[PDB]
Each structure stands twice: as C-alpha cells, then as structure tokens.
Amino acid sequence: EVCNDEVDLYLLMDCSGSIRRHNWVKHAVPLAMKLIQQLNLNENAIHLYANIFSNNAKEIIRLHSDASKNKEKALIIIKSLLSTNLPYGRTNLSDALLQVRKHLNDRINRENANQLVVILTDGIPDSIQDSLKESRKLNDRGVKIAVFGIGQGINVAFNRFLVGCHPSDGKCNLYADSAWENVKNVIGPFMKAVCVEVEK
C-alpha cells in the first residue's frame, strides 16, 4: 500500500444533496472504497476513522475499532452506505472537523501517530469561516489536512487554503481534484502524494 505508517486517518466524506444519488452509488461510495484500499490498516500502521457529513457529521467507523484496523471490515461499512437515504442536505464541514478535534481533546488518538484528515467533497462549506477556524485548531494540534475535490461545485482556492497551500500557485501535494467519472483514476496518486507528505 502507498500509505503505510503509524497514522490515525480521519476520512470525512461529504454526503450532501448536491452529489446526486447516481454519483453517490456509482462513484462516491466506490471512491471511499478505493481510498481505503490505498491504506495498510493494521494495529501497528494506519487506524481509520470515518464520518459522513451534510447537515451534520455522523460517525460511521470508530477510531481503533476492529473496522478501523482491518480493510475487509472497513469496506463492509462503507458499502453499507448504499442502502441508506443518502445523499442529502447541506455541507457542514466545520462539524465534521469538530468531531476530529473532539478525538484529540479527549485523547482518543494515538499520541505517537501522525494525524491526518482526508476530506472527500463536491462543494463549498456552509461556513468558510467556521471551517478554516476548526482547521487552524487542528493544525495547532499537529493535524495535517488533505482534500480531494470532485466536480464543478468545488472552490479550488478554498480547498488549497484549507490544506495550507497557496490558493493557486505551486505544487500542492495535499490537494487533488477530479470530474465525477474519473475519480477512481485520481485517488491512488493523490493518496501516494498525501502519505509522502505526512511522512516527511
């Protein structure tokens, strides 16, 4: 796997109504699955956390659970997202980020592990200010943030600002974007680049 290190990885999966059910089924859920496939989930390597967010954040994989540390068990849970009322609602990225900060506050995370947030999103947050504020508070706790943008509703400048890059210029290893139909071709190289940054 291109991601293989002691990393607590918080997958924040946008489930907003802007996605459209057919994209959710054919692309978003398969994208999360392929993302997970880039990770060595193990007690001594990556531990996964996952939430979905639209109106609010909802945890779907508990950090350090069996599914957090085993890829087959993680993939069953992601696949279970198909048989739901998703997608729907707005884009409450700040509440999704807040849940990660609650893990840190509460000392749930491995203190020894690098802390990485990976956001999958097709839009702009409800509150750019609340999002960038949470993100700062995460950054102060040593958290790195990566963003994978999808489709025409994103704002690339905001995404790049979020991950700590210049909004337009220069290489940004913590950011990538893709058209809906192309996401599974962009995810592997993105996760390779992100994991290289996290390690360096």
The only residue of 94, 109, 114, 135 in contact with Cl ion, by rule CB under 5 A: 94
Contact range with Cl ion by CB under 5 A, out of 40-48, 98-106, 122-130, 191-199: 122-130
φ, ψ for residue 106 (rounded to 5)?
Answer: -85, 0
The only residue of 4, 42, 70, 127 in contact with Cl ion, by rule CB under 5 A: 127
Structure tokens at 29: 């859920």
Size of the site for Cl ion (CB under 5 A): 7
54 marked as binding residue = no
CB nearer to Cl ion: pick between 14 and 177: 14
16 marked as binding residue = yes
CB nearer to Cl ion: pick between 16 and 178: 16
Pairing of strands 57-61, 46-53: antiparallel
122 marked as binding residue = yes
Per-residue three-class SS string for 88-140:
CCCCCHHHHHHHHHHHHHCCCCCCCCEEEEEEEECCCCCCHHHHHHHHHHHHH
The only residue of 87, 125, 149, 151 in contact with Cl ion, by rule CB under 5 A: 125
Strand partners, 61: 50
Minimum CB–partner distance for residue 98 and Cl ion (Å): 9
Q: Is 93 in the site for Cl ion (CB under 5 A)?
A: yes
The rounded distance, in Å, linking the Cα atoms of 37 and 11 is: 13
The only residue of 126, 151, 162, 187 in contact with Cl ion, by rule CB under 5 A: 126
Q: Is 121 in the site for Cl ion (CB under 5 A)?
A: no
Q: Is 123 in the site for Cl ion (CB under 5 A)?
A: no
Phi/psi-derived region of residue 95, left when phi > 0, alpha when psi is between -120 and 50, beta in every other case: alpha
130 marked as binding residue = yes
CB nearer to Cl ion: pick between 10 and 187: 10
Residue type, 169: D
Q: Give, for 61, the enclosing helix (H) or strand (E).
A: strand 57-61
Footprint of Cl ion (CB under 5 A): 92-94, 125-127, 131
Q: Which residues fall in the annotated binding site for Mg(2+)?
A: 16, 18, 94, 122, 130
